[PDB]
Design an enzyme around this catalytic site. Structure first.
Site, short mmCIF file in Angstrom:
data_model
loop_
_atom_site.label_atom_id
_atom_site.label_comp_id
_atom_site.label_asym_id
_atom_site.label_seq_id
_atom_site.Cartn_x
_atom_site.Cartn_y
_atom_site.Cartn_z
N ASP A 100 5.81 6.38 9.07
CA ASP A 100 5.65 6.46 7.62
C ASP A 100 4.48 7.37 7.24
O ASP A 100 3.72 7.08 6.34
CB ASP A 100 5.49 5.06 7.00
N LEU B 260 -4.15 -3.48 -6.85
CA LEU B 260 -4.15 -2.03 -6.68
C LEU B 260 -2.73 -1.47 -6.80
O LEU B 260 -2.53 -0.33 -7.20
CB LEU B 260 -4.77 -1.63 -5.34
N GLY B 261 -1.75 -2.29 -6.45
CA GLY B 261 -0.36 -1.88 -6.52
C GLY B 261 0.51 -2.79 -5.69
O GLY B 261 0.02 -3.72 -5.05
N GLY C 223 4.14 -2.47 -3.01
CA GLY C 223 5.25 -1.76 -2.41
C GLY C 223 6.42 -2.71 -2.30
O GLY C 223 6.41 -3.79 -2.89
N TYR D 29 7.19 -4.36 0.13
CA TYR D 29 6.93 -5.40 1.12
C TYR D 29 5.67 -6.23 0.89
O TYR D 29 5.44 -7.21 1.60
CB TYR D 29 6.92 -4.78 2.52
N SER D 30 4.86 -5.86 -0.09
CA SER D 30 3.58 -6.53 -0.28
C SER D 30 2.89 -6.13 -1.58
O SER D 30 3.33 -5.20 -2.27
CB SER D 30 2.65 -6.17 0.87
C1 E1B Z 1 0.56 -1.38 -2.61
C2 E1B Z 1 -0.32 -0.63 -2.91
C3 E1B Z 1 -1.42 0.31 -3.27
C4 E1B Z 1 -1.34 1.16 -4.36
C5 E1B Z 1 -2.39 2.01 -4.65
C6 E1B Z 1 -3.53 2.02 -3.85
C7 E1B Z 1 -3.59 1.17 -2.77
N1 E1B Z 1 -4.68 1.09 -1.88
C8 E1B Z 1 -5.11 0.76 -0.58
N2 E1B Z 1 -4.11 0.39 0.23
C9 E1B Z 1 -4.32 0.06 1.54
C10 E1B Z 1 -3.20 -0.31 2.35
C11 E1B Z 1 -3.41 -0.66 3.68
C12 E1B Z 1 -2.25 -1.04 4.55
O1 E1B Z 1 -1.22 -1.25 3.86
O2 E1B Z 1 -2.59 -0.95 5.76
C13 E1B Z 1 -4.72 -0.62 4.20
C14 E1B Z 1 -5.82 -0.26 3.41
C15 E1B Z 1 -5.60 0.10 2.05
C16 E1B Z 1 -6.74 0.48 1.19
C17 E1B Z 1 -8.09 0.53 1.64
N3 E1B Z 1 -9.07 0.90 0.78
C18 E1B Z 1 -8.78 1.21 -0.51
N4 E1B Z 1 -7.52 1.17 -0.96
C19 E1B Z 1 -6.47 0.80 -0.13
C20 E1B Z 1 -2.54 0.32 -2.48
#
Ligand code: E1B
Length: 327
Positions: free
Chosen positions: A154, A43-44, A46, A48-49
């Site tokens: 954040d 999905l992407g 950052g 850190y992850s």
């Molecule tokens: C990196 C990255 C990136 C870029 C684009 C879209 C998304 N999508 C989602 N990120 C989440 C992050 C967390 C967390 O970090 O606590 C928890 C649930 C979700 C989540 C839940 N459901 C759908 N999408 C996401 C992530």
């Protein structure tokens, strides 16, 4: 030195909790079965992850997997303990499991999946009602975490995931969250630039839950005025100048003077002198249907230089702006 500061609410939540609650470094992670989850698509990532959509094969449910980058090991248990402390709270994303990824050799957090509409698209379509409704759902999450002795640090559109179909909101990415302890000094390098509180921008370390309320105010201003992000600085110094062009320089000086803080001298030739502006100046024919006296007064009470003067989440929920939102 600097004059010390305390949160005006939930000041001693952690003080009277058991040490197991906030001593995250002592936390012992309970590991699940990594074979339960199958990655489906990236999905992407950052700083850190990396975050993947995935399927939980024990129930065929969609979930999301956050594989932590091998950096800042301290932060890992902090984020885990905070998620477990807050689990089940209103509008707090659910940590479903934690597993050891065999490739990265790091923890992978498994979260509930939210079928969201990205903010870049969603914000174009929010109605006046939607904005009050969703603001109210965000406040539930913030009062909850503050009442549990945790600041998010954040808050920004990306971290407020919204399924617009079911009107479902989740506050995500607690990777920057911290426990509030009275008198504790914190790192000011948190939040995204556009959502950094004046406290972070003038290097004041004894901040608290009220930081989140500034970020929330920046979100609100971007939503009601249809300008995202609202304060759009080029770097951390220009960010403060942008704010000062709206809130004015005199109240900025009042603020730093109250806490006997000194501005970085780099501001000497960029800050200038600015009057405080009225919020109406940001209203025009393309956003007026999103704006109301209640909206402006609510925004005004969130965006204050002095962190001690901002509305708390609980007070914000009492504001006339939310009278029209169906409870
Ligand atoms: C990196 C990255 C990136 C870029 C684009 C879209 C998304 N999508 C989602 N990120 C989440 C992050 C967390 C967390 O970090 O606590 C928890 C649930 C979700 C989540 C839940 N459901 C759908 N999408 C996401 C992530």
């Amino acid at each position: 030195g600097p004059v010390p500061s305390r949160a005006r609410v939930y000041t001693d939540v952690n003080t009277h909790r058991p040490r197991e609650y906030w001593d995250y470094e002592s936390h012992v992670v309970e590991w699940g079965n990594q074979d339960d989850y199958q990655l489906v698509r990236k999905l992407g990532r950052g700083k850190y992850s990396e975050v993947f959509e995935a399927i939980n094969i024990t129930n065929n449910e969609k979930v999301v997997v956050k594989i932590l980058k091998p950096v800042k090991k301290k932060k890992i248990k902090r984020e885990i303990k905070i998620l477990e402390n807050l689990r089940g709270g209103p509008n707090i994303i659910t940590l479903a499991d934690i597993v050891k990824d065999p490739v990265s050799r790091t923890p992978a957090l498994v979260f509930e999946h939210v079928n969201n509409t990205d903010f870049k698209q969603l914000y174009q379509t929010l109605t006046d009602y939607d904005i009050r409704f969703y603001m109210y759902e965000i406040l539930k999450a913030l009062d909850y975490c503050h009442s549990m002795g945790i600041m998010h640090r954040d808050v920004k559109p990306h971290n407020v995931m919204i399924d617009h179909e079911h009107r479902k909101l989740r506050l995500i990415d607690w990777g920057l969250a911290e426990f509030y302890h009275p008198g504790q000094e914190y790192n000011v390098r948190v939040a995204s630039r556009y959502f950094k509180g004046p406290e972070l921008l003038v290097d004041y370390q004894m901040y608290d839950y009220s930081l989140d309320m500034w970020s929330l105010g920046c979100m609100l201003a971007s939503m009601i005025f249809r300008k995202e992000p609202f304060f759009h600085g080029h770097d951390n110094y220009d960010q403060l100048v942008r704010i000062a062009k709206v809130l004015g320089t005199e109240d900025l000086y009042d603020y730093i003077d109250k806490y006997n803080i000194e501005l970085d001298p780099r501001f000497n030739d960029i800050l200038g002198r600015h009057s405080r502006k009225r919020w109406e100046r940001f209203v025009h024919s393309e956003n007026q249907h999103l704006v109301s006296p209640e909206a402006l007064d609510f925004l005004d009470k969130l965006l204050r230089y002095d962190h001690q003067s901002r509305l708390t989440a609980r007070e914000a929920m009492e504001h006339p702006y939310f009278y029209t939102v169906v409870k």
